[PDB]
Amino acid sequence: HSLCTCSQLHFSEETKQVLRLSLTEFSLPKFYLLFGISKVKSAAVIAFRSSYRDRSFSPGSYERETFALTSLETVTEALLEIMEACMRDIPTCKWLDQWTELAQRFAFQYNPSLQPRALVVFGCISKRVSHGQIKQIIRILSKALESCLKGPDTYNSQVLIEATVIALTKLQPLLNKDSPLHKALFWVAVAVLQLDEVNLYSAGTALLEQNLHTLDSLRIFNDKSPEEVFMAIRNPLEWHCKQMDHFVGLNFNSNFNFALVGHLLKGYRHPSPAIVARTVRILHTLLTLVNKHRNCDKFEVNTQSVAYLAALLTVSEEVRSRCSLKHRSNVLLDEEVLTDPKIQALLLTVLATLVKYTTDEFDQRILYEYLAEASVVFPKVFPVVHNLLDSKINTLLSLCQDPNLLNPIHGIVQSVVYHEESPPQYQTSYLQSFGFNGLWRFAGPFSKQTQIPDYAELIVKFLDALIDTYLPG
Amino acid sequence: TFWEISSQMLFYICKKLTSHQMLSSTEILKWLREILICRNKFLLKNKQADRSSGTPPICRQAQTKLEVALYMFLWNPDTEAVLVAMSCFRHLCEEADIRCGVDEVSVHNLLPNYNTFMEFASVSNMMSTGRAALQKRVMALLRRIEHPTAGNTEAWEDTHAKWEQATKLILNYPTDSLQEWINMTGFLCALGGVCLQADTPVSKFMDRLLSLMVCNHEKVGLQIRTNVKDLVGLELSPALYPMLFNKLKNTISKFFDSQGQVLLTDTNTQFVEQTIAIMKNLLDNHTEGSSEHLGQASIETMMLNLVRYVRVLGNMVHAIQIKTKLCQLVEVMMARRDDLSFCQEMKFRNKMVEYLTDWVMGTSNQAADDDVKCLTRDLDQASMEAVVSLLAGLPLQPEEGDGVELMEAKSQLFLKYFTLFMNLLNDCSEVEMSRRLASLRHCTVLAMSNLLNANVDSGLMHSIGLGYHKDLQTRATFMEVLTKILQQGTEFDTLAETVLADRFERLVELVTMMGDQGELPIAMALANVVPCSQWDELARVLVTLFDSRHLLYQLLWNMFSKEVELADSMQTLFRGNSLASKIMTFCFKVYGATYLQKLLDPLLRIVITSSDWQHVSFEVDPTRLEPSESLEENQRNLLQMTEKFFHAIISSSSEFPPQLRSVCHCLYQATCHSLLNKPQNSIGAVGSAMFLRFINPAIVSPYEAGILDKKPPPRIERGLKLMSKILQSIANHVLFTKEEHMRPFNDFVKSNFDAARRFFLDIASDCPTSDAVNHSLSFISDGNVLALHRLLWNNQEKIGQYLSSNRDHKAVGRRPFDKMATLLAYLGPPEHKPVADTHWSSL
Amino acid sequence: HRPVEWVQAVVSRFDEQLPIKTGQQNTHTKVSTEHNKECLINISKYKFSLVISGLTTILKNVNNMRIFGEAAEKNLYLSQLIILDTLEKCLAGQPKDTMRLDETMLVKQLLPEICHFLHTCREGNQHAAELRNSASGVL
Numbered sequence A: 001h002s003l004c005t006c007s008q009l010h011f012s013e014e015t016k017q018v019l020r021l022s023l024t025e026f027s028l029p030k031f032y033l034l035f036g037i038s039k040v041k042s043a044a045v046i047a048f049r050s051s052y053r054d055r056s057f058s059p060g061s062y063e064r065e066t067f068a069l070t071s072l073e074t075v076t077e078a079l080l081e082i083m084e085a086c087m088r089d090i091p092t093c094k095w096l097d098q099w100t101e102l103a104q105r106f107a108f109q110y111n112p113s114l115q116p117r118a119l120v121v122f123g124c125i126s127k128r129v130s131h132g133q134i135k136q137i138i139r140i141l142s143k144a145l146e147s148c149l150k151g152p153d154t155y156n157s158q159v160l161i162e163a164t165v166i167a168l169t170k171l172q173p174l175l176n177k178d179s180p181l182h183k184a185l186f187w188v189a190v191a192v193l194q195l196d197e198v199n200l201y202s203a204g205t206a207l208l209e210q211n212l213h214t215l216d217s218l219r220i221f222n223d224k225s226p227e228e229v230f231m232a233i234r235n236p237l238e239w240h241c242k243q244m245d246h247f248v249g250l251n252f253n254s255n256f257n258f259a260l261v262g263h264l265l266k267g268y269r270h271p272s273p274a275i276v277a278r279t280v281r282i283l284h285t286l287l288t289l290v291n292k293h294r295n296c297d298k299f300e301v302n303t304q305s306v307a308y309l310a311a312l313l314t315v316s317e318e319v320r321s322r323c324s325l326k327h328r329s330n331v332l333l334d335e336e337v338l339t340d341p342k343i344q345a346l347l348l349t350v351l352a353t354l355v356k357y358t359t360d361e362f363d364q365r366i367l368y369e370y371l372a373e374a375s376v377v378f379p380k381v382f383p384v385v386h387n388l389l390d391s392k393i394n395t396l397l398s399l400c401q402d403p404n405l406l407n408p409i410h411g412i413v414q415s416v417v418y419h420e421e422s423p424p425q426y427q428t429s430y431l432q433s434f435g436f437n438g439l440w441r442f443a444g445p446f447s448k449q450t451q452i453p454d455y456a457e458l459i460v461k462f463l464d465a466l467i468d469t470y471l472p473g
Numbered sequence B: 001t002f003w004e005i006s007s008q009m010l011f012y013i014c015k016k017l018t019s020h021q022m023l024s025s026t027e028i029l030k031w032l033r034e035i036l037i038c039r040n041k042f043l044l045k046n047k048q049a050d051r052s053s054g055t056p057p058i059c060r061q062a063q064t065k066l067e068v069a070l071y072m073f074l075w076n077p078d079t080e081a082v083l084v085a086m087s088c089f090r091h092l093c094e095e096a097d098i099r100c101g102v103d104e105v106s107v108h109n110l111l112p113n114y115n116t117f118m119e120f121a122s123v124s125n126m127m128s129t130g131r132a133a134l135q136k137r138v139m140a141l142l143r144r145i146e147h148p149t150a151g152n153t154e155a156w157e158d159t160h161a162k163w164e165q166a167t168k169l170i171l172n173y174p175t176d177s178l179q180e181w182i183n184m185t186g187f188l189c190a191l192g193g194v195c196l197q198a199d200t201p202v203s204k205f206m207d208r209l210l211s212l213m214v215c216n217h218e219k220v221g222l223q224i225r226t227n228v229k230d231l232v233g234l235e236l237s238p239a240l241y242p243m244l245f246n247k248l249k250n251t252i253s254k255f256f257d258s259q260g261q262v263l264l265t266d267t268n269t270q271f272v273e274q275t276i277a278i279m280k281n282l283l284d285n286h287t288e289g290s291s292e293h294l295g296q297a298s299i300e301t302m303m304l305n306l307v308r309y310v311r312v313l314g315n316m317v318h319a320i321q322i323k324t325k326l327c328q329l330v331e332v333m334m335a336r337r338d339d340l341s342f343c344q345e346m347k348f349r350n351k352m353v354e355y356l357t358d359w360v361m362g363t364s365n366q367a368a369d370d371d372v373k374c375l376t377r378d379l380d381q382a383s384m385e386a387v388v389s390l391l392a393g394l395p396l397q398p399e400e401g402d403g404v405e406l407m408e409a410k411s412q413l414f415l416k417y418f419t420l421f422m423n424l425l426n427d428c429s430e431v432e433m434s435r436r437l438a439s440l441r442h443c444t445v446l447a448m449s450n451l452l453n454a455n456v457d458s459g460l461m462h463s464i465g466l467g468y469h470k471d472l473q474t475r476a477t478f479m480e481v482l483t484k485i486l487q488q489g490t491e492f493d494t495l496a497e498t499v500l501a502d503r504f505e506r507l508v509e510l511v512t513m514m515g516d517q518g519e520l521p522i523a524m525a526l527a528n529v530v531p532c533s534q535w536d537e538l539a540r541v542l543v544t545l546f547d548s549r550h551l552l553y554q555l556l557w558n559m560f561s562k563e564v565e566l567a568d569s570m571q572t573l574f575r576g577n578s579l580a581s582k583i584m585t586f587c588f589k590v591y592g593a594t595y596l597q598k599l600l601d602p603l604l605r606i607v608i609t610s611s612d613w614q615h616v617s618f619e620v621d622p623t624r625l626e627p628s629e630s631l632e633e634n635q636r637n638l639l640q641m642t643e644k645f646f647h648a649i650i651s652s653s654s655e656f657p658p659q660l661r662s663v664c665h666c667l668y669q670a671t672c673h674s675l676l677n678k679p680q681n682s683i684g685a686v687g688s689a690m691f692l693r694f695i696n697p698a699i700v701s702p703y704e705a706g707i708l709d710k711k712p713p714p715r716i717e718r719g720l721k722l723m724s725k726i727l728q729s730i731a732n733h734v735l736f737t738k739e740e741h742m743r744p745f746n747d748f749v750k751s752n753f754d755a756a757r758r759f760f761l762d763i764a765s766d767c768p769t770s771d772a773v774n775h776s777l778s779f780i781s782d783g784n785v786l787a788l789h790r791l792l793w794n795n796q797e798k799i800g801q802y803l804s805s806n807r808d809h810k811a812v813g814r815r816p817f818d819k820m821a822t823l824l825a826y827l828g829p830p831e832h833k834p835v836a837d838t839h840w841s842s843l
Numbered sequence C: 001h002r003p004v005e006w007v008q009a010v011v012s013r014f015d016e017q018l019p020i021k022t023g024q025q026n027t028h029t030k031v032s033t034e035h036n037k038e039c040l041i042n043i044s045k046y047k048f049s050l051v052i053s054g055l056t057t058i059l060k061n062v063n064n065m066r067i068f069g070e071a072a073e074k075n076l077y078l079s080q081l082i083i084l085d086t087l088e089k090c091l092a093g094q095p096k097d098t099m100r101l102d103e104t105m106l107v108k109q110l111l112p113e114i115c116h117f118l119h120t121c122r123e124g125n126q127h128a129a130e131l132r133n134s135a136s137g138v139l
């Protein structure tokens, strides 16, 4: 309000309209929630007390709401919008350069009460970043992890990680167009999803989603495929990477597309309905890139582009119609192209996994119809899908009362007995042989007992080598 | 022989089902269904091989009874019976297509209520539920039977005679028996409209119906009244309001003797208590088509008489609750004031305020010394809410029982109410139940605020004393009110032309937000979210606003495309009732009116009045052909007259308004795009469509359109009717089939087939984007804008939900929902509407 | 390993829908419980020995069941009717494998229970008439 009614400054009539809209916005119920005073009808009343001379204040209800560093960005960017409008009129203003300096001092200094907030703000406002700055940010994340496992105070340092990731999501689109780290920040995002915490997972996708968007604008996927780019830069530090894949139970050398999808499938279990739609968009953007490398119309089925279509099967209508089950264009499960025993063992685990935890009629209908048809077209490899399907079907047979959902399950039972009477060629442990023994485990629900999976002792070393190789000094 | 006998079997069996109830009735019906299935196939194959298929009178005399027996089963208690009966309407429909494939010509002429019958099918395909829940769905569909028919008007009467006699048995005799009586009543109410149009079967239904609301029968009396109130309120057909009110009013009018003295009677008190519950539910529910009918009747005189009787009832725990409910009715009667019709709105609102202030008496429960009369607190709480609604926008007017200067009279009147509210305000002070006082005090100030705004001139002086009032919370409100009063101009002053014009300038930009690729999210979203009741208002506002912005083409393309693409029967739906449909109606009526009258009018003088035409019969029907006049003379004259009209229509291509020219193009592109996905000519459908719905209606009955002051003589009328048929055939390029009456004329149409095409193409040839055709009128359209802002405020929350579901791809901060909330709050609540001097009127 | 345990579920659900066994209103308009039969019939083609043996025990248990009352008798009559009708369809449905090594079931498990009905069975004038008619087709 003081800005709108000040004479020292001479704002044109254009600027003053920007401010007045800001004045109204801040009084909406949306911003009462951001500041944390929702359930308060008017702020003025609570701020002041009438009997302030007679008696002292009597605070109570010590129960205190929490704060989310995502809220701070929304406010921190509302203010930044106001300030820039002013700098347009005020010639040679220094406001933004003074504010940045104040943030940059607390951002890179250890203070467990101010550091997280000074990083979410340093990135949201800063206009330039150098390699020397990025190394410090990525080495605050390395020390943050080390503290978590060493000590018993976890939540204290589980916000210094989420703040380092949020900063990086903002500082990358400012990096030099020819820097290696433009690509090495694809493994930071991946190495963060593996920590199994709802906030860390939520922040990790936001870095991933924009990592693809930025690389496109730099035209790096023009003549190469995702697997080629990210797997080429991982080579120098393969030794540390290899060990992680062993414990997480996914492999990237065996099959890239599947490993990348494997992590994203946990997104379907996120409590927030806004992170569910973000992992769907990340799948489309990955699908449209692999096919473009082969000039295959963006919905063709091949070995490369089959993993992302099973994930999009139950959410994208165009995928379902353009890839239809044969026993009602081309039909998923084609045995002409999917003629590799491995490439058809994985594609069944994805489908079995998606139903093991799903609870929805519309989803269970669609997924089982593709599993019956899989039972016949792939008789030999189907026995690797029993334990995953073992428990839930057994319950459905006993108590289900839906003709629409009870038909396909019966088709599954009949196929199994028919193609029995032969010594099992592929056992249930066929997947552990070549790496993906954890694919079904990694997609479980988020653990209520929030704890680092304790294989984070390797994520520290991986990060450490990443710095040493690409940021020598 | 098949139809001679097979049809004659149906006539025997159907007549049996209707006559009386039988144990196996629900079984004969299942068998009757398959017979219908099994005689469609023989007609289907028979028509394919040789259409030549005969329809003797028995085929008609037996088709009726089939319908007369399929309605009367809808109220049958057995759930299976009703479900099966509903499914039997498909086979009654599918037979229509086979006999005549072309939809418009016959499918809506042989079977007038074709569209509704299809709806019965979907409801049948639903999970089974108790008879009550199913009856709700049945009575909804039974209420949409628009067209009178022999089946309808005899299913209504036949079930009436049963209804009448059944009633006597229940009453005269001093549960399953009752349940049937309920079902027959509900059916006989939802479907009342068809038989509409002094002593009549319909009218006798109402009188008997009203003579049951007061039914005092010790045995089952209570249950009868509980259900007649429930039905007449929530289930009566909207085509019967004008008759319900008039009878409802007359019943009351005789409660008052000569010289206007109430005659209290125990039954008379029971009748009013019922007339309040009926009216409240009747008014409360917003349904399709109800609005148009509320206008016809005048509800004023009933309302005034209703209070006086309740006014004199006295004071007691019983009579107080009646006073409460009547007060709540007057609140609901003031939320629909725009729909209702008032002969004198002002003179009526003042009296009600006069009659209601007397009931707000505080501190009367302490003197009464009984907590049982704490209700009197609720009466005061209820009374004020009525007075708030009544006073919102009401100038004062004193009754002229004595003669004084009008201004002097008002100031006295204002002070009368001001002190009354002030006194009630002092009592409510907490120092002198907290929730009760908080609400009542809040209301009493809002009531006072509305009193001042309308009457600043006569009431500001008396009101300044609120500035130094003793209650701090009350002093803030009085200051906020006066902030408005200053801000509003004293005179026109071109103050809204400057302040309001600039203040509300941004509003249209938000509504006219050009969604990328013609999305227009605000308009599209606003369409679905808005309740269907206000579709009339929404249609006019959108069309008017977009025209001012020179973007009408954009709206039509988006709106029509969804409807046409959703339903491949593009033409059929547009003529049907829907939000998209009503858009066309407004477009044609608002702009077409001038074009038609200017063109047709000169020709009408020639035929109607010119001595040269003199007296001649434009008739070629051999049955009606008069021997006096030669057939050749009539045929040649009728053809000659048709040429006059046809030539004028083709020549006047330029005079076509630009608005319709744009309207036709969008349909042309829609069908052309529709064709691509699917030798059909887009112009052919367009030309027939436009001509059939815009040009054709005026010619048939120019008097109703208002072209001609006096109704044309019947002999002149016939020529116009036959003229339309000949003209319409030209558009479809269809010769006279089984129309030997007009076959001689078939020669004439052949030459003009090419000519008709040129006229259609010229309008359809307008540029898709009118870069060259430009008219930068950019009129302010002040009056329309106010309604638009008013509409948005009411549905602020719900329109947000529709926006919330989609648009996840991009943050909504720069998208409608963020912009809507910010701007809408900024402008603040809309002002109350001003009153209407004129009677209720509509498009 | 598992699929054998999958069949048991289809069989086990069969028992709990026999009228004499508590109905529990699991019929779901009989569409749910009728579909189960079709599966039980279909499975027999490849696990003939297993399915048939399971059916015999279900019949044997019903026979050694004592119940009194008009409702009681009607439930058991309709109960045994379904078992026999299903059992015959399995035999007829089974292709002509003509495997004559089913002696184990026939000699002890099956013949004694089918033979029981063929006796006069004068309990019901109208019920026993159908049971003999239905049972004979099985034999």
Ligand SMILES: [Zn+2]
Pocket (backbone or CB within 6 Å): B342, B343, B839
């Ligand atoms: Zn009038």
